[PDB]
Specification:
The structure is cut from a larger assembly and holds chains A, B, C, D, E and F. Chain C is mainly beta. Helices cover 4% and strands 44% of the residues of chain C. Chain C has one helix spanning 311-323, and strands at 3-7, 14-18, 23-27, 32-37, 46-48, 55-58, 62-66, 72-80, 82-88, 93-98, 102-107, 112-118, 124-129, 136-140, 144-148, 157-160, 166-171, 177-182, 187-191, 196-201, 210-213, 219-223, 226-230, 258-261, 269-272, 278-283, 286-291. In chain D, 33% of the residues are buried. Chain D is 68% helix and 0% strand. In chain D, helix 19 runs parallel beside helix 21 (376-392). In chain F, 35% of the residues lie in helices and 0% in strands. Chain F contains 2 helices and no strands. Chain F has helices at 10-13, 36-48. The chains are: A mainly beta, B alpha+beta, C mainly beta, D mainly alpha, E little secondary structure, F mainly alpha. Chains A and B meet through strand 21 of A and helix 2 and helix 3 of B. The structure holds magnesium ion (MG) (2 copies). The structure holds one RNA strand. Chain A: It is found in: Nucleus, Nucleolus. Chain A: Involved in nucleolar processing of pre-18S ribosomal RNA and ribosome assembly. Chain A: This is U3 small nucleolar RNA-associated protein 21. Chain A: WD repeats lie at residues 22-53, 63-93, 101-140, 150-183, 190-227, 234-269, 277-329, 336-370, 397-436, 445-479, 487-523, 528-563, 565-606, 608-640.
RNA sequence: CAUUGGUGAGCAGCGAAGGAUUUGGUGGAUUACUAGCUAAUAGCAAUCUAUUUCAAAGAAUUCAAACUUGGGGGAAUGCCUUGUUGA
């Protein structure tokens, strides 16, 4: 499983995996700790810049996160890890197989709740010790005492008490002596979330049927009762800027705000996060600022701000609605295609099943930006025919880019599923282009290619017709008709003289682009599926249907190498920049690196999830892959 | 009137001066060590200086009435009755969606002089000066041609 | 940034000069911007001349005089590389010092260089005017403080008040006390009437960049981002020595009267608002005024300076002050 | 931000300091009785002397004004300055000013009020500090000459910029523009808060209610096409209706009757909101004139119901409440008058409620059906319920008579219901 | 003119927060 | 504690009546009036001139 | 006859609960992502400042110090250099 050429580097474009993020304050500034699968990333609240990432991937997925000043605690399976600046400092291993579920830190005690309704307490060996390390005791809540534990919370000014919140009711445990001081009355509806209020002795409890309860622990009595019919609360948070507001999140993806003093609704922010992916998984007010941070399972983190009231008087009543301030995001579903935008490793294009194309920056996370799909106005003056409701373009099956004429006109071609034309994009503008290329044979787009000079775009139809358009004007110029089945690959050499095509018929044709003549025709044994053309070396590799990669020398039109060993389809493959290796992925959950000079497999890997795509950097430093699971991109460093 | 009483708080005895932050809690400079009950009571005051006590917690509690209308507004978010349940259509707004055109499957070469929907089956009949009778099977997504019938020299008006 | 601030003698106008070259003259109370230059040059300090109508700016190599609206009026070719500026109001002289170690006095009324003096002590590090006698105090890199008058080619008095360069100097209104700070992390309060050292706070946490004295007598100190104020420090009795902390509540020790911390900013200059209880602070991100009760003179005298002066009063005062200009020669200890 | 922008904010804060003479001239020049040149010449003592007399005349008209003699119009108030006071003190002054603007809201036509408010404009600069409360109180006098003067001396807040044109303009603001000012939602919340204060103090008067009603009705009309805005309007304006209905004063309730009806026609609503509306309307219904307006409102609301159960019987609590405030004799009188509005759906619901809850009124059913012609679907529902009654309730002369009525008119429908039921 | 609705720049401000470290006590 | 600041009543120092003279406060502290001898000297010289 | 002149009145064609032009505000980027403050080998982040002082170290005959001037001719009174008189 361990490659001798490649090693994992990071995941790009993943901002949050749905686990509630944790907020920690260093002096004035605030930072946000977010979960990304098996690692966590720390973001600065002011600019949402990436600051730190955990050095190593945890053995099991992170479940809960709590941050306290420099130190960050991440809980995976039965182990609770302490991290400083993304460097593990110490590991708290619990003595039971039960997985930790919730995590609370107040003062020198650390509380970890396992799924077996057992609460472990750790303490600091010394009063000035930075983090708790020693094992103090173990408290367990039985089913008679209360139901499953929903969350562990600590209220201010409670000496060595932990407010355990259960589905049935709320309990108060004195960790120092491990005795149950108080059990709250039973609550009819299952509890889902808890939140300590800025007021004293009052903790906000979110139920499964749209109730929020300001339960007073000291008095053991309800104070207030909100109703949100037909909803499930997922998060709660109070505003500490001096105005008595409450933000209530819902699983449906809607965030509501109430003015407790006035008993009224300020506003509702609708569908801030997709309902499908868990909606508002976490929504927290920053301590003493008008800004509220929200996250969700759709791989997005957002921030909203409450502007000052416009009314010189009675500012309390006239409340501006919240305003989008800033955000960072990524794909909601695994990327389908990737490609390197630049000769350097700066920018990456990614297209996903979520019908969105993104530009990801390897050098910095902030630079990552989405390609807007707003269409340019038609030159003819005719009205563009489309549904009034705006819907994103279908996913991108194939893509091609060039940088010879960046900034002058469109330089990207993309094909869509079940769509009879290919759309253009402009990298410099980061916006869809003004040309659409039609196959002209009632066939769907299966291949897209561009000349090196950036002037010609080739579109391969499923009915065997290859069309050539001009990128700067989008006017059809020529059309080649050789294949009788779908063409699955097109490429043009660096000199723009010799052109090569391949189709499901298993035939490879050699065309002379300048004179428009068929130089020669080659038939292979099996249908061809994909093609990569290496312009420097004039070798191109075909992923045949018999689980073979065939290298052919365009100048001479002969098979030079044939690679065997794959146990299943070849989903994707790429050439090394120098023209010496081919890295191919297959459905047998492997990535094999093939040495073209010797024609044998020199390295092999077994990935847990099949790799849909593999792409070398033109420099040769990095190798990126996308997989059937995971919203991000795995980046690898070429140890060679 | 506290529901519960914690005895460990009456015995616990904490020093103040060890940490800088707690130093504010002293009442007199001689004082250096206090039992728990006063430590909690002092912590309560400092907490208030951080987050002032708002109006809603203290003065107000929930614990034919005139305020019926204001209540029902609070619970409901959607103030417009669902049109799915009602069996009259709304007056000014039409909820209308386009489908695939019926004639895409087999085009007409002359104007569509008449249209008709079969009483029970899902069929549509078209005619024109093309002198043809085209019957289409309207599904809304494909709309293929069931049959066609050419009537030589009989321009179709209806 | 950073921004150097100077207030008008009557407290009606504020002059700020960004280091990279944004000079702005404004009436801060009523929020009217009189002038705003965006000189693409380095400006070091600026001062208001006889009234708010004219101000001077010390640019990269020359000093320039400007009008109320921002028109330059003169380019002072003689003053080379001036770093600090001061204006003697009764005498109508503009004073300069800089990297040349030359003290140049220029009369604004006649436009003639009254006298130019050779300091012979390398670049000048600090400067302040004694309001009582209009004798100029220069610090130097050798740790001495020298007193100069236009009529004397040699310094009147030389005081050794530090072990390294003197970063700043301040003189009270009465012209009786002087506060000097050095690069040796030491503050020294001087009695300039008799030239006897009163206090020496030998060890400071960090070097003090600037010092200032209010009308009421508050001593102000700035150390990088910190700003600290002491009350009754300027006095002969021993108990008035500035102290940062009282040991066990000893009443005699003089703890700070007020303190403030600009988190990430290095203070550039401190200037009291003349007749209001406010302290101006220049720093990297702009200008800030702190509220310092008791700082300023509550009871101003309208004949001499008047914050509520109308334009007709301003022009009448501009002449009668010009008529009885004290000759430059009259300056003496 | 640029240096100029920040200094502008400093100027706006420092508007009323009167730093120099020129500033003192502009501030002192603003007036509601006098021109600029005379205004500059006057002194606070002369201005206060007129106000003290003017307040006395207002006191005779209304005793409540006499209280401000102890606070705002006292001889000590001459020496009182706002710029010199602390933050806590200015709030008490603002509260005193806001209370006075409420009392003077209804007496702007009288001459003395214009003198009395001059003292506040000159001494306390309400035209600069309490700008919002002054405009809100005098919004309904928009065509009056007094309102023109207010605009000239006042700097408009951000919410009132619709009037920016009409400052120092010969034409007074038109009726159409006032709809624009109310159209923005933010103003409605502001006006709602001011209106709420009036109800709490019972300071309302007919003219304010008339003008407040006319704007709110028009705002709905201007938003008839845009459904999504109308949805945002319901939380605000219906909330006002609940407050107006709480008021004891009848004219306040009648305004709630106007405003409720227009939404019901403007936007279809859920029955629960409609039913909730009835209970609020009927809780405080004591005045006869409000009582007449209520009954028309109740009937109009049900007509807007266009869903299943549109003619379902009222809930039991609602039925008992309705009969208490409207005996059977009253509704028969309402059914009598030839110019009645269409009320068939309510009578169908009110009809079925009797059969479920009140047996002894079953005779009244006969009278009610004769007076009004009900729709065929409504009649079918009545027949269906009465059929169940006969099976359960003991057979009565009135009960059979009600059938006998249905025998006479549309006999065939009677069989259809019987065929489907029995 | 209609009401101008401008998005004023919002920058962070210092706010005091209660620290739980004072809470834990040892006998 | 007890905080007090230099506090100017603008009405005292800028008259309300546009016709009225402006107030002229006066402080005789010598610290506010430096160069007592030199100023009187020039006023003697100018009187002679 | 021609307008690749202006201003309009209408078609053909394009055409999913509208289309087109202009504009204010904010947010993210425009260099390659190791967190805030301070008296910084650690504290604070609720600050302490009732230990923040003492001790130790620390002063070139460099006792030099315009490298900073638009050209020509001078410079009473100044200032620089040199010598001199008398204390
Ligand atoms: Mg714009
Ligand atoms: Mg010369």
């Amino acid at each position: 499983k361990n490659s001798k050429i490649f090693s994992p580097f990071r995941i790009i474009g993943n901002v949050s995996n749905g686990v509630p993020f944790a907020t920690g304050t260093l002096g004035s500034t605030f930072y946000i700790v977010t979960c990304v699968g098996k690692t966590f990333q720390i973001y600065d609240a002011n600019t949402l810049h990436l600051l730190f990432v955990s050095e190593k991937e945890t053995p099991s997925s992170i479940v809960a996160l709590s941050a306290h000043f420099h130190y960050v605690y991440a809980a995976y399976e039965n182990k609770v890890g302490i991290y400083k600046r993304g460097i593990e400092e110490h590991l708290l291993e619990l003595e039971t197989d039960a997985n930790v579920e919730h995590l609370c830190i107040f003062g020198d005690y650390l509380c970890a709740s396992t799924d077996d309704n057992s609460i472990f307490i750790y303490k600091k060996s010394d009063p000035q010790d930075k983090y708790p390390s020693e094992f103090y005791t173990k408290l367990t809540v039985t089913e008679i005492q209360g139901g499953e534990i929903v969350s562990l919370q600590h209220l201010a000014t409670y000496l060595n008490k932990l407010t355990v919140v259960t589905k049935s009711n709320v309990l108060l445990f004195n960790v120092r002596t491990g005795k149950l001081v108080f059990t709250s009355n039973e609550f009819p509806d299952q509890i889902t979330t808890a939140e300590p209020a800025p007021v004293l002795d009052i903790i906000a409890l979110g139920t499964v049927t749209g109730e929020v309860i300001m339960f007073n622990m000291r008095k053991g009595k309800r104070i207030r009762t909100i109703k949100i019919p037909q909803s499930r609360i997922s998060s709660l948070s109070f505003r500490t800027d001096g105005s008595s507001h409450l933000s209530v999140g819902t699983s449906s993806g809607d965030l509501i705000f109430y003015d407790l003093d006035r008993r009224s609704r300020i506003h509702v922010l609708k569908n801030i996060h997709r309902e499908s992916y868990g909606g508002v998984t976490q929504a927290t007010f920053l301590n003493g600022q008008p800004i509220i941070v929200t996250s969700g399972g759709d791989n997005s983190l957002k921030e909203y701000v409450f502007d000052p009231s416009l009314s010189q008087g009675s500012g309390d009543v006239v409340v501006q609605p919240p305003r989008y301030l800033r955000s960072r995001g990524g794909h909601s579903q695994p990327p389908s295609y990737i490609a390197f935008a630049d000769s350097q490793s700066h920018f990456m294009l990614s297209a996903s099943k979520d019908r969105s194309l993104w530009s990801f920056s390897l050098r910095k996370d902030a630079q990552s930006q989405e390609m807007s799909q707003r269409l340019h106005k038609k030159q003819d003056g005719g009205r563009v025919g489309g549904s009034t409701i705006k819907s994103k373009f279908p996913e991108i099956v194939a893509l091609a880019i060039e940088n010879a004429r960046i900034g002058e006109w469109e330089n990207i071609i993309t094909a869509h599923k079940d769509e009879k034309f290919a759309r253009t994009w402009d990298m410099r503008n980061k916006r869809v282009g003004r040309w659409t290329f039609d196959t002209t044979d009632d066939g769907f787009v299966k291949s897209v290619a561009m000349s090196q000079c950036g002037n010609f775009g080739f579109i391969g139809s499923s009915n065997g017709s290859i069309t050539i358009y001009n990128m700067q004007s989008g006017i059809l110029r020529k059309k080649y008709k050789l294949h009788k089945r779908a063409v699955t690959g097109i490429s043009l050499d660096g000199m723009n003289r010799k052109m090569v095509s391949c189709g499901l018929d298993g035939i490879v044709g050699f065309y002379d682009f300048n004179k428009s003549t068929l130089l020669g025709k080659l038939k292979l044994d099996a249908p061809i599926t994909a093609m990569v053309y290496h312009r420097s070396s004039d070798l191109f590799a075909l992923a045949l249907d018999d689980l073979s990669i065939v290298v052919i020398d365009a100048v001479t039109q002969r098979v030079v190498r044939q690679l065997w060993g794959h146990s299943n389809r070849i989903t994707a493959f790429d050439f090394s920049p120098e023209g010496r290796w081919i890295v191919s992925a297959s459905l047998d959950s492997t990535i094999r690196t093939w040495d073209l000079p010797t024609g044998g497999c020199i390295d092999g890997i077994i990935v847990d999830n099949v790799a849909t795509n593999v792409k070398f950097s033109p420099n040769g430093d990095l190798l990126a892959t996308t997989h059937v699971t995971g919203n991000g991109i795995c980046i690898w460093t070429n140890r060679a | 009137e506290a529901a519960w009483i914690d005895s460990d708080d009456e015995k616990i005895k904490v020093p103040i001066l060890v940490t800088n932050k707690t130093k504010k809690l002293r009442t007199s400079y001689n004082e250096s060590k206090i039992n728990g009950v006063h430590y909690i009571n002092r912590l309560r005051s400092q907490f208030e200086k951080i987050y002032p006590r708002p109006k809603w917690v203290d003065d107000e509690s929930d614990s034919g009435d005139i305020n019926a209308l204001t209540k029902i507004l609070s619970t409901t978010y959607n103030y417009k009755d669902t049109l799915s349940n009602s069996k009259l259509l709304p007056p000014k707004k039409l909820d209308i969606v386009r489908l695939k055109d019926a004639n895409a499957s087999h085009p007409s070469h002359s104007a569509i002089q008449s249209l008709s929907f079969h009483p029970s089956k899902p069929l549509l009949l078209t005619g024109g000066y093309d002198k043809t009778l085209r019957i289409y099977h309207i599904d809304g997504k494909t709309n293929h041609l069931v049959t066609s019938l050419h009537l030589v020299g009989s321009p179709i008006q209806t | 940034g950073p921004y150097h601030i100077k207030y008008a003698k009557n407290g009606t106008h504020l002059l700020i000069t960004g280091r990279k070259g944004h000079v702005a003259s404004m009436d801060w109370r009523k929020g009217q911007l009189r002038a705003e230059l965006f000189l693409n040059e380095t400006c070091h300090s600026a001062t208001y001349l006889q009234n708010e109508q004219y101000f001077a700016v010390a640019q990269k190599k020359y000093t320039f005089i400007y009008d109320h609206e921002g028109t330059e009026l003169h380019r002072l070719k003689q003053h080379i590389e001036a770093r600090h500026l001061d204006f003697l109001p009764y005498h109508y002289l503009l004073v300069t010092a800089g990297e040349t170690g030359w003290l140049k006095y220029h009369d604004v009324s006649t436009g003639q260089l009254v006298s130019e003096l050779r300091t012979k002590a390398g670049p000048t590090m600090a400067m302040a005017q004694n309001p009582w006698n209009a004798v100029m105090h220069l610090g130097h890199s050798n740790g001495t403080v020298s007193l100069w008058s236009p009529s004397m080619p040699e310094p009147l008095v030389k005081l050794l008040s530090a072990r390294g360069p003197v970063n700043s100097i301040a003189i009270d209104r009465s012209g009786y006390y002087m506060a000097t700070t050095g690069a040796d992390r030491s503050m020294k309060i001087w009695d300039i009437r008799n030239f006897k050292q009163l206090h020496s706070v030998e060890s400071l946490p960090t070097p003090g960049t600037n010092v200032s004295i209010s009308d009421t007598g508050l001593l102000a100190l700035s150390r990088g981002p910190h700003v600290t104020l002491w009350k009754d420090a300027l006095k002969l009795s021993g108990d008035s020595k500035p102290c940062f902390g009282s040991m066990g509540g000893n009443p005699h020790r003089n703890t700070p009267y007020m303190s403030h911390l600009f988190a990430g900013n290095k203070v550039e200059n401190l200037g009291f608002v003349p007749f209001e209880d406010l302290l101006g602070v220049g720093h990297q991100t702009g200008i800030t005024n702190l509220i310092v009760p008791g700082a300023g003179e509550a009871n101003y005298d309208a004949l001499e300076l008047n914050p509520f002066e109308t334009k007709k009063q301003r022009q009448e005062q501009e002449v009668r002050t010009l008529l009885n200009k004290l000759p430059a020669d009259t300056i003496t200890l | 931000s640029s240096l100029s922008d920040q200094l502008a904010q400093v100027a706006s804060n420092n508007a009323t300091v009167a730093l120099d003479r020129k500033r003192r001239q502009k501030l002192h020049s603003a007036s509601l009785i006098y021109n600029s040149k005379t205004a500059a010449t006057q002194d606070y003592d002369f201005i206060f002397e007129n106000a003290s007399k003017a307040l006395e005349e207002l006191s005779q008209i209304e005793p409540k004004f006499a209280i401000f003699s102890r606070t705002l119009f006292s001889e000590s108030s001459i020496s009182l300055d706002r710029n010199v006071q602390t933050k806590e003190e200015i709030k008490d002054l603002d509260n005193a000013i806001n209370a006075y603007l409420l009392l003077a809201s209804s007496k702007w036509y009288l001459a003395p009020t214009l003198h009395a408010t001059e003292w506040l404009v000159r001494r306390f600069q309400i035209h600069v500090k309490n700008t919002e409360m002054l405009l809100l109180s005098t919004l309904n006098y928009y065509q009056t000459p007094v309102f023109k003067r207010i605009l000239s001396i006042i700097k408009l807040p951000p919410l009132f910029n619709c009037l920016s044109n009409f400052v120092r303009s010969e034409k007074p603001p038109t009726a159409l523009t006032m709809i624009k000012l109310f159209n923005d939602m933010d103003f409605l919340k502001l006006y709602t808060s001011y209106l709420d204060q009036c109800i709490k103090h019972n300071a309302t008067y007919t003219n304010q209610l008339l003008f407040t009603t006319c704007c709110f009705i028009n705002v709905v009309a201007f938003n008839s096409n845009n459904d999504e805005k109308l949805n945002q309007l319901v939380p605000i304006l219906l909330e006002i209706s609940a407050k107006l209905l709480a008021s004891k004063s009848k004219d306040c309730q009648i305004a709630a009757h106007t405003i409720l009806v227009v939404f019901a026609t403007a936007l279809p609503l859920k029955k629960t909101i409609i039913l909730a509306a009835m209970e609020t309307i009927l809780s405080n219904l004591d005045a006869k004139e409000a009582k007449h307006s209520a009954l028309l409102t109740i009937c109009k609301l049900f007509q807007t119901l266009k869903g299943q159960g549109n003619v379902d019987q009222l809930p039991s609590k609602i039925f008992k409440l309705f009969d208490s405030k409207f005996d059977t004799v009253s509704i028969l009188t309402f059914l009598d008058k030839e110019d009645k509005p269409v009320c068939d759906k309510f009578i169908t619901s009110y009809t079925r409620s009797i059969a479920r809850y009140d047996r002894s009124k079953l005779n009244i059913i006969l009278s009610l059906l004769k007076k009004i012609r009900l729709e065929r679907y409504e009649v079918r529902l009545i027949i269906t319920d009465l059929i169940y009654l006969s099976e359960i309730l003991e057979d009565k002369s009135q009960l059979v008579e009600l059938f006998e009525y249905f025998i006479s008119i549309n006999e065939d429908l009677v069989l259809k219901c019987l065929k489907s039921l029995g | 003119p209609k009401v101008v609705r401008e998005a004023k720049k919002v920058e962070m401000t210092e706010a005091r927060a209660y620290n739980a470290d004072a809470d834990t006590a040892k006998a | 504690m007890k905080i007090k600041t230099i506090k100017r009543s603008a009405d005292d120092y800028v008259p309300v009546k546009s016709t009225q003279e402006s107030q002229m406060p006066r402080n005789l502290n010598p610290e506010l009036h430096p160069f007592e001898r030199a100023r009187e000297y020039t006023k003697a010289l100018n009187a002679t001139k």
